[PDB]
Design a protein around this ligand. Structure first.
Ligand code: PLM
Ligand code: PLM
Ligand code: FE
Ligand code: FE
Ligand code: MN
Ligand code: MN
Ligand code: MN3
Ligand code: MN3
Lengths: 272, 285
């Protein structure tokens, strides 16, 4: 049952950080994947040899599954914060969920346009990738339906926002730019990446806000965060190594960048 | 719970799915931002009103504000249950649905803040019938879906949420706002909001129609479940409407001041009409 309603007893908390982030999401989130012109991507793709075509698909396969998992798996976070009465968080999360839906749409439109919609790209998900996206991520978010304790929320935000978004996604945007932007290939896709990268800045800020406000309550939670981060690193790097190994471009630069993101996300949370 | 795979890796979005097409319309038609609405004239209007006229408008606003908030929170179980069923295109659309309702919450709250009543507790205008619908039956029907996503459960959730709350009460609220405040020329920023809300609502009701019908299409038995759940909530729909009416009939000074003949019998009949029209938008097959 509802005991009452915040915007009937009072108003929105206009100064709340997540209301501010919601306002910025509406302002900066107007893009529409249906407006991206993929015609040249299609031509670029067909101009590749079979072997070059294949080299492109692992990274797209990681992203398409990623965007789909994140669209589905943010719902428990929204439910748990809703149940906690965190109205402004929920408003923001409506823009978060809608962003990920557009991200799903973007990669699928690209697949459709370049002619691989009918191909099953699951073959490029190795065991490490499945451990994160098929298993650890949904386990950690679905937990929130029955256990919204500080520890559960931090673990959910660590896997979703600091690992998948803050570490793999950010590294994937950089990777696309280092490989295809220099080659002049897939300009529609890279336009998409630009929009996704901009959305991701807000998504990561929500993860930081969430984790830090729980840490501020008890610095014992800081240790949990670092522990959950380190528990996932071997699959992050197991996946990265798998991708790198297929690519054989400075692949060792890209691998540094993953490490640099991982440590950056740890340093964005304050012990105190 | 594991993911077994992902549609957009094995295949693509179903580009021709009705809910993907509704999703596309939502993105095209749903750009409006409540932060862009100018309420400065509304603030002047409200302050020019006497105390009796000031409170004349508030029962309706109280009903909407809680409605918007309830609907923002309570659509999340429907999105979960369709996501668990693998209905990706429905989920895409529901992201636009939930964002619309968030903007609806924001719109009414901005208006309350702007006119100077954000600090007033408007729960006093929720009678017993309203609470039966919005504080109880609605969250019960939606929350059920976390442990019972059966056709019977999904039909009941869509009925309460899309056909009763949206299709009957919200639609009749939009109409009432226009018959009264648009006629009198008051609260232009609010009415701009109401028109955006009304446009959004069309999609929300169409999702409800799609959902109920696709279930009825699998077994006609469910059509009579739909009708019975509609009739079960009617006494609360009309009990709330009568409450608003009785309030409206005893606070006549706004109508007098602004030269309006508020036909409350006409408004009642619009609500009855909406209830029966929503019933008729569902067929046995
Ligand atoms: C080859 C160098 C390794 C670079 C790392 C690339 C990882 C690919 C990204 C796949 C997961 C993307 C998750 C989506 C996040 C979101 O939608 O917010
Ligand atoms: C005086 C005549 C009464 C007419 C009926 C008035 C009904 C008031 C509406 C309040 C409930 C609105 C629910 C919001 C629904 C939504 O956000 O989709
Ligand atoms: Fe994201
Ligand atoms: Fe609605
Ligand atoms: Mn390994
Ligand atoms: Mn009664
Ligand atoms: Mn994304
Ligand atoms: Mn609404």
């Amino acid at each position: 049952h509802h005991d009452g309603f915040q915007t009937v007893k009072a108003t929105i908390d206009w100064e709340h950080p997540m209301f501010k982030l919601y306002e910025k999401a509406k302002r900066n989130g107007k893009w529409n994947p249906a407006d991206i012109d993929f015609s040249q991507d299609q031509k670029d793709f067909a101009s590749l040899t079979s072997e070059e075509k294949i080299s492109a698909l692992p990274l797209v396969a990681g992203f398409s599954a990623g965007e789909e998992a994140l669209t589905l798996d943010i719902l428990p976070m929204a439910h748990a914060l809703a149940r906690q009465g965190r109205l402004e968080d929920v408003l923001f999360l409506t823009t978060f969920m809608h962003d990920e839906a557009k991200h799903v749409e973007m990669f699928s439109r690209w697949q459709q346009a370049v002619g691989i919609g009918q191909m099953d790209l699951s073959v490029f998900h190795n065991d490490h990738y499945k451990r994160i996206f098929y298993e650890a991520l949904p386990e950690a978010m679905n937990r929130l339906y029955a256990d919204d304790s500080p520890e559960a929320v931090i673990r959910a935000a660590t896997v979703y926002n600091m690992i998948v978004e803050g570490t793999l996604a950010e590294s994937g945007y950089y990777t696309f730019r280092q490989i295809y932007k220099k080659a002049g290939l897939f300009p529609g896709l890279l336009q998409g990446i630009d929009y996704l990268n901009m959305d991701e800045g807000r998504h990561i800020q929500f993860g930081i806000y969430t984790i830090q406000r729980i840490v501020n309550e008890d610095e014992r939670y800081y240790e949990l965060f670092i522990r959950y981060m380190d528990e996932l690193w071997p699959h992050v790097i197991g996946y990265v190594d798998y991708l790198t190994e297929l690519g054989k471009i400075d692949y060792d630069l890209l691998r540094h960048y993953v490490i640099k993101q991982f440590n950056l996300r740890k340093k964005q949370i304050s012990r105190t």
